[PDB]
Symmetry: C2
Subunit: 31 residues, 2 copies
């Protein structure tokens, strides 16, 4: 079960990084 949690953390981290990239993209579009 420990491996599952560790996989979820790495998964959520990658997702969060993508959302930050999306924010940077959308902010770049603003103007």
């Amino acid at each position: 079960r420990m491996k599952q949690l560790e996989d979820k953390i790495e998964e959520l981290l990658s997702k969060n990084y993508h959302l930050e990239n999306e924010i940077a993209r959308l902010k770049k579009l603003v103007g």
Copy 2:
């Protein structure tokens, strides 16, 4: 160790939802 990993998930999930809320507002402004 269980608790540490579980707290990290709850932390990252909370940040995730705040990022999604911000993206939703930005898409409206830009017209996406």
